[PDB]
Design an enzyme around this catalytic site. Structure first.
Site, mmCIF file in Angstrom:
data_model
loop_
_atom_site.group_PDB
_atom_site.id
_atom_site.type_symbol
_atom_site.label_atom_id
_atom_site.label_comp_id
_atom_site.label_asym_id
_atom_site.label_seq_id
_atom_site.Cartn_x
_atom_site.Cartn_y
_atom_site.Cartn_z
ATOM 1 N N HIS A 1 2.453 9.978 4.657
ATOM 2 C CA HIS A 1 2.223 8.474 4.225
ATOM 3 C C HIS A 1 3.598 7.797 4.118
ATOM 4 O O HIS A 1 3.842 6.597 4.355
ATOM 5 C CB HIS A 1 1.491 8.375 2.769
ATOM 6 C CG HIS A 1 2.205 8.762 1.661
ATOM 7 N ND1 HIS A 1 2.041 9.862 0.965
ATOM 8 C CD2 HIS A 1 3.032 8.177 0.842
ATOM 9 C CE1 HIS A 1 2.922 10.276 0.064
ATOM 10 N NE2 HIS A 1 3.493 8.950 -0.200
ATOM 11 N N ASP B 1 -0.878 15.250 4.975
ATOM 12 C CA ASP B 1 0.276 14.465 4.332
ATOM 13 C C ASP B 1 1.595 15.147 4.592
ATOM 14 O O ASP B 1 2.363 15.527 3.831
ATOM 15 C CB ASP B 1 -0.020 14.097 2.714
ATOM 16 C CG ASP B 1 0.600 12.898 2.435
ATOM 17 O OD1 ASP B 1 1.366 12.339 3.483
ATOM 18 O OD2 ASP B 1 0.355 12.337 1.385
ATOM 19 N N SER C 1 2.713 14.819 -2.303
ATOM 20 C CA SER C 1 1.899 13.612 -1.689
ATOM 21 C C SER C 1 1.488 12.596 -2.783
ATOM 22 O O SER C 1 1.590 11.525 -2.685
ATOM 23 C CB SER C 1 0.636 14.398 -1.255
ATOM 24 O OG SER C 1 -0.267 13.256 -1.069
#
Lengths: 185, 51
Positions: free
Chosen positions: A33, A63, A156
Site C-alpha cells: 500500500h 500487502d 500492513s
C-alpha cells in the site's frame, strides 16, 4: 538505514521493512500500500537523500512492495534498528514478536491468529495475514515484525493505537521473499 | 475528504496527516474518518496537513 526507519515517497511516510538482496542488488521491502503509485523514495522529509525506486508492488490481495536501492553510499544494515536479523520464518500462533516503526518505535506482543482477511474497504481486501495484539499507528506501515533474529512480517495495518492497545496485521515476509527471489542478510 | 463509507474495521498505516477540529493531528484519512464516526459526526476537518 535499517528496518523500522522512516521512508518517504511522494505522497507520505511509511517505514522500511527489511533490507534484502539478490546477488549484488540491494533492495528494501515495505508495504504494498506504500509502494502503490510511488516511484521514488527518500530517506528524509526534505527529500534530499534519495534511497531508490519502486521495483514491485502487490496490494491489495497481498500487502508487499520492493524498492531497488539507487543510492550508493548510504549504509544498508541487515538489522532492525540495532537488532540483527539472520533469517526469515513463518509465524505461528502464540509466537512472541516485536514490531518497529517510524512513528511509535518498538512494541511487542504475540501472534494471535494466521491466515486472516482484512478488508480495508473499497475493494482493498488483503488475505493471508498474520494477526497479533501489537499496536501500530500511521507511519508505521511496512515496518518489520520480527522475533529475535528472525524476520517474520511487514506491517500492513489494523485498529486501535498504542495508548489504548490495538490489533495489527502483518503480511508474511516469506511470501515477499519468494515472490522477488531475494533474501534477508 | 468524505467519511460516508465509514466506519471501517481496519486502516492501513501510511502517514498523510489531517488536522481535526479537536486540534488533533490524524495520521491519515482512514483514521480521521473512524474518529468522525466515533464522535457521532461532531469532529470535522480543520485542514489538511498536521495541526
Amino acid at each position: 538505514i535499517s528496518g523500522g526507519d522512516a521512508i518517504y515517497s511522494s505522497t507520505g511516510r511509511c517505514s522500511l521493512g527489511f533490507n534484502v538482496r539478490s546477488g549484488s542488488t540491494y533492495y528494501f521491502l515495505t508495504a504494498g500500500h506504500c509502494t502503490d503509485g510511488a516511484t521514488t523514495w527518500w530517506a528524509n522529509s526534505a527529500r534530499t537523500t534519495v534511497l531508490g525506486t519502486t521495483s514491485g508492488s502487490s496490494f491489495p490481495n497481498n500487502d508487499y512492495g520492493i524498492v531497488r536501492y539507487t543510492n550508493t553510499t548510504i549504509p544498508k544494515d541487515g538489522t532492525v534498528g540495532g537488532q540483527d536479523i539472520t533469517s526469515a520464518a513463518n509465524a505461528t500462533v502464540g509466537m512472541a514478536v516485536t514490531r518497529r516503526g517510524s512513528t511509535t518505535g518498538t512494541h511487542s506482543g504475540s501472534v494471535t491468529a494466521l491466515n486472516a482477511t482484512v478488508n480495508y474497504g473499497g475493494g482493498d481486501v488483503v488475505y493471508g495475514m498474520i494477526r497479533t495484539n501489537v499496536c501500530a499507528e500511521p507511519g508505521d506501515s511496512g515496518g518489520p515484525l520480527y522475533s529475535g533474529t528472525r524476520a517474520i512480517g511487514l506491517t500492513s495495518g489494523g485498529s486501535g493505537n498504542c495508548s489504548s492497545g490495538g490489533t495489527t496485521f502483518f503480511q508474511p515476509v516469506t511470501e515477499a521473499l519468494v515472490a522477488y527471489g531475494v533474501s534477508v542478510y | 475528504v468524505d467519511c460516508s463509507e465509514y466506519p471501517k474495521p481496519a486502516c492501513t498505516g501510511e502517514y498523510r496527516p489531517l488536522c481535526g477540529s479537536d486540534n488533533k493531528t490524524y495520521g491519515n484519512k482512514c483514521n480521521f474518518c473512524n474518529a468522525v464516526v466515533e464522535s457521532n459526526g461532531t469532529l470535522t476537518l480543520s485542514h489538511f496537513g498536521k495541526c
